[PDB]
Amino acid sequence: LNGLTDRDLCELNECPLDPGGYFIINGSEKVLIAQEKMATNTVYVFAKKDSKYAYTGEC
Amino acid sequence: FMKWKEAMFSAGMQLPTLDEINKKELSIKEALNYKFNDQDIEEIVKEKERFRKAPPNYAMKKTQL
Secondary structure, three states: OOOOOHHHHHHOOOOOOOOOOOEEEOOEEEOOOOOOOOOOOOOEEEOOOOOOOOOEEEO | OHHHHHHHHHHOOOOOOHHHHHHHHHHHHHHHOOOOOOOOHHHHHHHHHHHOOOOOOOOHHHHHO
């Protein structure tokens, strides 16, 4: 359905309002949740006090 | 029936036998209840679509794709 007309979408038993962008595995609509983490290649500096180090630069 | 009998007698073709008709009529009966377990559905649909035009009707998008 890459850039298909609403006509063909309806003919194919689909609607043009479906945002799409979800997989169909074993007949179920699967959606991937965007996971977040710390940005790589950046040097952070923390001051964990519950340890032996006063300051810590992480990369 | 009489016309067909006269035509057969004039043409010379020996009339079928009663037992022949009795054993032949069962052919249609046993063929009607024939299970479609072999691979004949493919040939049937092919021979149908050979003459049945494509656009009709709910497969327009599929045909375009």
